[PDB]
Design a protein around this ligand. Structure first.
Ligand SMILES: [Hg+2]
Ligand SMILES: [Hg+2]
Lengths: 287, 97
């Protein structure tokens, strides 16, 4: 076509904050950050390469879209959120033009999630309806905030065979915020048998199924190598160095993301012991 | 659903309204009128002609404060106990449906 490019410029501009999501490659991508209920407003700038050049179009649109995209191949894709703003009726453009848009209080229920088997995305999409329409997408990030009291639930998990070997792990809460510290103690209540190796691991389970069809991808956020072995021990796990996401549960039934503490132990007999507990992560407001 | 104040003068037996909502403390921050709030209790029932009905409390109203005390995130018992202070005038700050 005759357009050099489609530009989307938010009003918030310099002042509005930005966030970084990891792409599939692992490069950082920076985008403007929004919350539930916040307005999305700006300008759409269309530039012709050459002025006085008629373009006949069926329409000019901008949309705000919250998308869930499942298994990487299409098309289980559905838009839980869709707003439309018509910038121009069927007609023509002979010269660069700059449209205003404003979506007034925009539901953004879910935090953007880029996953191996699922993607939840928000974007502004400029569409020029022709003849194959011209499309431009402008990526937005949404964070889900929450609030919980500072108290100690003092959960514990144990790895125990019976009378001969017993190991207890005790930590302060079942719900941690994204910059929180997990505070723990590993009690050796009983060791009739030497311990070859002990691990504490923080892992994420992304469950990306619909109905009977179900799939789990597991990743290990952290490892605490308590014992190379073999001879209680205080545990402090600092969530802020890492890059976890809040717990996301049954999001549109499409997927869930959950976080677990695993206590893994290996004895002198090379027998493995495993105990797993779920913890809930949340994002504390910036302010 | 912009926030407004409501003054309910105890009449006879009750304030003439009921509250339902979450048992847990805290929760997600969601927008009401583009403004973010922790989960809120709401008015489940209003007794017709009762003291809350005259004061202009409407069904569905979500309680942001009780006598100026913010109750975002509060459990159902907390709010209910706070309403039952027993004081003859109750002032609510509510977010209408
Ligand atoms: Hg250009
Ligand atoms: Hg033994």
């Amino acid at each position: 076509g005759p357009i050099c490019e489609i530009d989307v410029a938010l009003n918030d501009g310099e002042t509005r904050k930005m966030a970084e999501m990891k792409t599939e490659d692992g490069k950082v991508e920076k985008h403007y950050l929004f919350y539930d209920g916040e307005s999305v407003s700006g300008k759409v700038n269309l530039a012709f390469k050459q002025p006085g050049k008629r373009l006949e179009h069926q329409g000019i649109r901008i949309e705000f879209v919250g998308q869930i995209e499942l298994f990487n191949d299409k098309s289980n894709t559905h838009e839980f959120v869709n707003l439309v703003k018509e910038l121009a009726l069927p007609g023509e453009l002979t010269q660069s033009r700059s449209y205003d848009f404003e979506f007034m209080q925009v539901e953004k229920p879910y935090e953007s999630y880029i996953g191996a088997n699922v993607r939840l995305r928000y974007f502004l999409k400029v569409t020029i309806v022709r003849r194959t329409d011209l499309v431009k997408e402008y990526d937005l990030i949404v964070h889900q905030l929450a609030t919980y009291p500072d108290v100690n639930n003092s959960i514990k998990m144990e790895v125990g065979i019976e009378d001969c070997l017993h190991i207890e792990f005790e930590y302060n809460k079942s719900k941690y915020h994204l910059k929180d510290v997990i505070v723990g103690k590993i009690y050796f209540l009983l060791v009739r048998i030497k311990i070859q190796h002990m691990e504490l691991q923080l892992i994420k389970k992304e469950i990306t199924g619909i109905g009977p069809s179900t799939t789990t991808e597991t990743e290990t956020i952290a490892k605490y190598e308590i014992m190379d072995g073999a001879p209680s021990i205080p545990i402090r796990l600092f969530l802020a160095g890492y890059d976890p996401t809040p717990t996301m549960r049954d999001v549109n039934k499409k997927f869930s993301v959950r976080y677990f503490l695993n206590l893994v132990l290996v004895d002198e007999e090379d027998r493995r012991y495993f105990k797993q507990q779920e913890i809930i992560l949340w994002r504390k407001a910036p302010e | 659903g912009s926030p407004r104040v409501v003054r309910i003068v105890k009449s006879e037996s009750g304030y003439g309204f009921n509250v339902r909502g979450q048992v847990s403390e805290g929760g997600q921050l969601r927008s009401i009128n583009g403004e973010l709030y922790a989960p809120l209790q709401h008015v489940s029932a209003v007794l017709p002609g009762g003291a809350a009905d005259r004061a202009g409390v409407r069904k569905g109203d979500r309680i942001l404060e009780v006598n100026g005390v913010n109750v975002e995130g509060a459990t159902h018992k907390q709010v209910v106990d706070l309403i039952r202070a027993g004081e003859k005038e109750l002032i609510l700050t509510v977010l209408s449906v």
